[PDB]
Amino acid sequence: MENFQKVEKIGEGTYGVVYKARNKLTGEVVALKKIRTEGVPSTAIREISLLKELNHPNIVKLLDVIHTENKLYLVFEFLHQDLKKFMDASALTGIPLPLIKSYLFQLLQGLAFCHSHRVLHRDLKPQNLLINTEGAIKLADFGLARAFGVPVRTYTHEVVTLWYRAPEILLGCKYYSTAVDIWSLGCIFAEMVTRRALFPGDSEIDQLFRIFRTLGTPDEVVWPGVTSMPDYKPSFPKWARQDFSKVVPPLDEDGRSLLSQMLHYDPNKRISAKAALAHPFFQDVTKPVPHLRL
Numbered sequence: 001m002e003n004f005q006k007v008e009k010i011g012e013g014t015y016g017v018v019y020k021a022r023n024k025l026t027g028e029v030v031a032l033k034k035i036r037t038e039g040v041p042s043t044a045i046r047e048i049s050l051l052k053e054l055n056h057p058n059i060v061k062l063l064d065v066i067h068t069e070n071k072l073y074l075v076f077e078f079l080h081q082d083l084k085k086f087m088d089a090s091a092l093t094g095i096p097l098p099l100i101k102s103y104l105f106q107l108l109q110g111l112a113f114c115h116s117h118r119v120l121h122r123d124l125k126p127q128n129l130l131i132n133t134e135g136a137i138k139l140a141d142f143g144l145a146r147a148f149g150v151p152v153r154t155y156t157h158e159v160v161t162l163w164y165r166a167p168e169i170l171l172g173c174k175y176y177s178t179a180v181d182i183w184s185l186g187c188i189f190a191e192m193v194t195r196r197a198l199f200p201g202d203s204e205i206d207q208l209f210r211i212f213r214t215l216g217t218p219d220e221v222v223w224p225g226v227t228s229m230p231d232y233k234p235s236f237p238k239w240a241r242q243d244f245s246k247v248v249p250p251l252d253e254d255g256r257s258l259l260s261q262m263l264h265y266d267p268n269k270r271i272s273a274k275a276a277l278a279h280p281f282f283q284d285v286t287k288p289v290p291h292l293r294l
């Protein structure tokens with residue numbers, strides 16, 4: 001708070017506010033997140049610790065961790081812009097396919113790395129995917145649902161986005177697998193391509209039903225065990241599955257086949273980040289530099 005001079009407020013994470021700040025000593029510009037209170041569960045520091053020791057080009061680097069008076073500060077390397085802003089800025093023309101491919105490929109490397117270190121992101125969304133002028137994209141905000149909790153909002157009455165939530169989460173599964181991050185990334189990939197959220201739900205049930213309306217109401221054939229899930233209701237409407245050709249035009253067939261594997265209902269059939277990296281869609285992958293307006 002003192003060694004840092006809050007330059008500007010950057011956002012409202014689901015755990016606290018993020019500020020752009022400068023280290024009045026080292027002159028470095030960083031992203032500082034203030035964590036939301038009555039003791040600060042130490043159990044989380046462990047989670048945090050593993051994070052600082054995590055080092056990969058596609059994961060935002062956690063520089064310093066500061067615990068002081070129910071207040072937990074996380075100091076991250078500062079990235080230039082988030083993917084939400086970039087997508088909005090690119091809405092008239094769309095992000096060029098080679099860049100979409102580059103970003104997806106890089107995020108999959110980020111996830112493959114996290115997942116191999118047994119770390120789950122849990123809340124991937126455009127707002128927490130950060131980019132720089134050099135063409136990189138990194139994963140920020142690693143949820144920390146176990147390292148903290150999922151009350152009702154972000155921290156001060158704010159509409160949490162459910163658009164990228166995997167169906168198994170929406171159906172009440174208490175234990176998520178790495179597959180939930182692949183689902184979220186698939187939703188994001190579709191969005192980059194079409195310039196419209198794939199499943200823009202405004203409530204958990206609306207989110208679930210929009211998924212059902214597009215991918216078809218799941219049943220025991222495509223998703224063994226689904227009818228026994230916590231929030232599953234035999235009374236759910238039975239919608240037929242729509243063709244991907246209609247869901248994500250003009251994504252070429254390789255892109256659509258990859259997307260379909262990222263959006264399989266069954267967490268166990270859903271493609272892994274490692275396997276996704278070997279998908280033919282990335283045969284011609286390159287690393288373009290984006291036109292960023294900072």
Ligand SMILES: Nc1nc(Nc2ccc(S(N)(=O)=O)cc2)sc1C(=O)Nc1cccc(F)c1
Binds near residue numbers: 013082141
């Ligand atoms: N590292 C890092 N850099 C950031 N910069 C940034 C600059 C401009 C825009 S923008 N709306 O495009 O102009 C957006 C972001 S944000 C962030 C970060 O790490 N957030 C974060 C989020 C949630 C939890 C958490 F712990 C950290």
